[PDB]
């Protein structure tokens, strides 16, 4: 087998779009928002300090 080095970390469709979206509920965030983020529609505040 070979491999390809991706420049931008990419999401695994199976773990996102599978009817129960396991990334979604693992982060307890609805799917609509995650889709909104991956497609560059909105930001998300990761640890916005004080």
């Amino acid at each position: 087998m070979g491999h390809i080095e991706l420049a931008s970390p990419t999401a695994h469709i199976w773990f996102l779009k599978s009817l129960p979206s396991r990334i979604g509920l693992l982060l307890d965030m609805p799917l609509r928002d995650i889709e909104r983020v991956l497609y560059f529609e909105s930001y998300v505040v990761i640890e916005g300090g004080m």
């Binding site: 609509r32 889709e35 909104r36 497609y39 560059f40 529609e41």
Partner: protein, 471 residues
């Protein structure tokens, strides 16, 4: 936004937001680019030791170990004139280094103004900018770690750091004056006094070889960053304005083996190239210049990354000429053009005509459904030709057995000779000389023994078992 997942639609919206800049706005932004590049040009002239490498590699070019066009591509208001200007440059620089101890500031300014006339091929711009950037990186890491040493442990205010370190950046007075302030971290600084001061010495060594100080190096390089970033922002605005042109040209080359967006992306890259290389001094609309790149880029990308089995670009041009000629011959002749008729109309000898005709075929997908049957594809038919047939394996085994028995039929040393001369039950077969080495007697007698053994295999009733394997 209706959650439209289609990436085409969201790219189109983002593009749609940036409004179209008018006719004069274009000239404005081009002036922005010239002004930024001019600012950075003055700044680079204002830095030293750059002329050192200029003079050095121009001299290299005079000795003829390089090319005259690797530094300049024509000046603005002949090698001889450059040679004399570089001579006066060496003279002015060395004399200003002598007179460094006030007047040298004016002498460096005169050096800069006499150098102003020269331009410099991009590659050297890259070399100089990277040298000064890496010097800034190094200075910044040292300064930041010192400032860390102060604030993270002592909660040290900052005006004091500035005055103590900044202003001189050369004498050791501030280091020990900090310790005179009786602060405890300043007393601990003796632990790394060696490293801090040795890095200060390196700073002085870079300064002297450059022949300046630091605070003004910081000032000049930060102005260079300001100018370059300003110019880049202007270029960003320009390209965002002309994305529409990119799409307009892109819509032409539709499904020709490249996803629409791949086309528009290649067009965006071409537009970047055009913008960065455009000269407004003509007067004519940028769009005219940018097109001549956008079409170029799209065509190049289709040429290279379209086909599965890639074909050189000149071959693609040949095939396109082929298609064109064919079209015309079909409409004139009515029927169709035969390869002979093409060899008439085109100058190739018709051998390359049939070569080009064979080359063009794209591979067919193995999943294509076979006729009137949606449960049997093509992949289910192509067979594996490499696989050896079991019959042949049984034959090879039987032959191995027979040759083993017939070798056992021979004498010991003859059998070893015959086994080693060939590869039976061993790796690579040794030549007569190496088998002789194995026997340590190396000469022709051994070829006599091999041939004698073979002759003994001629004898009937012993070789019949091996005669059988012939067919």
């Amino acid at each position: 936004i209706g959650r439209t997942t289609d990436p085409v639609r969201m790219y189109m919206r983002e593009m749609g937001t940036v409004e179209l800049l008018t006719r004069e706005g274009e000239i404005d932004i081009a002036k922005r680019i010239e002004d930024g590049i001019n600012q950075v040009q003055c700044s680079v002239a204002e830095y030293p030791e750059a002329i050192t490498y200029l003079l050095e590699q121009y001299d290299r070019v005079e000795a003829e170990e390089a090319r005259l066009s690797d530094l300049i591509t024509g000046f603005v208001d002949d090698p001889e004139l450059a040679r004399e200007k570089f001579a006066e440059l060496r003279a002015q620089y060395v004399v200003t280094r002598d007179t460094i101890k006030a007047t040298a500031q004016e002498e460096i300014l005169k050096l800069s103004e006499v150098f102003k006339q020269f331009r410099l091929v991009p590659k050297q711009f890259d070399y100089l900018v990277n040298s000064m950037r890496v010097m800034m990186d190094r200075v910044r890491t040292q300064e930041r770690l010192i400032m860390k040493l102060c604030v993270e442990q002592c909660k040290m205010p900052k005006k004091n750091f500035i005055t103590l370190f900044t202003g001189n950046e050369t004498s050791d007075t501030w280091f020990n004056a900090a310790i005179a302030m009786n602060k405890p971290w300043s007393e601990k600084l003796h632990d790394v006094s060696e490293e801090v001061h040795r890095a200060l010495q390196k700073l002085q060594q870079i300064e002297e070889e450059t022949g300046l100080t630091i605070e003004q190096v910081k000032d000049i390089n930060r102005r260079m960053s300001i100018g370059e970033a300003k110019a880049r922002r202007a270029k960003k605005e320009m390209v965002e304005a002309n994305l529409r042109l990119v799409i307009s040209i892109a819509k032409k080359y539709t499904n020709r083996g490249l996803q629409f967006l791949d086309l528009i992306q290649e067009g965006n890259i071409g537009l970047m190239k055009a913008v960065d290389k455009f000269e407004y001094r003509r007067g004519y609309k940028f769009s005219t210049y940018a097109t001549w790149w956008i079409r170029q880029a799209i065509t190049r990308s289709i040429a290279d990354q379209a086909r599965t089995i890639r074909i050189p670009v000149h071959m693609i041009e040949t095939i396109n000429k082929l298609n064109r000629i064919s079209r015309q011959m079909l409409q004139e002749m009515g029927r169709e053009p035969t390869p002979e008729e093409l060899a008439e109309r085109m100058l190739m000898p018709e051998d390359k005509i049939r070569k080009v005709l064979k080359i063009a075929k794209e591979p067919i997908s193995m999943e294509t459904p076979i006729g009137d049957d949606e449960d049997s594809h093509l992949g289910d038919f192509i067979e594996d030709t490499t696989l050896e047939l079991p019959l042949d394996s049984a034959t090879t085994e039987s032959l191995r057995a027979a040759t083993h028995d017939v070798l056992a039929g021979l004498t010991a040393r003859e059998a070893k000779v015959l086994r080693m001369r060939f590869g039976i039950d061993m790796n690579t077969d040794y030549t007569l000389e190496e088998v002789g080495k194995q026997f340590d007697v190396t000469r022709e007698r051994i070829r006599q023994i091999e041939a004698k053994a073979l002759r003994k295999l001629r004898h009937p009733s012993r070789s019949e078992v091996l005669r059988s394997f012939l067919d």
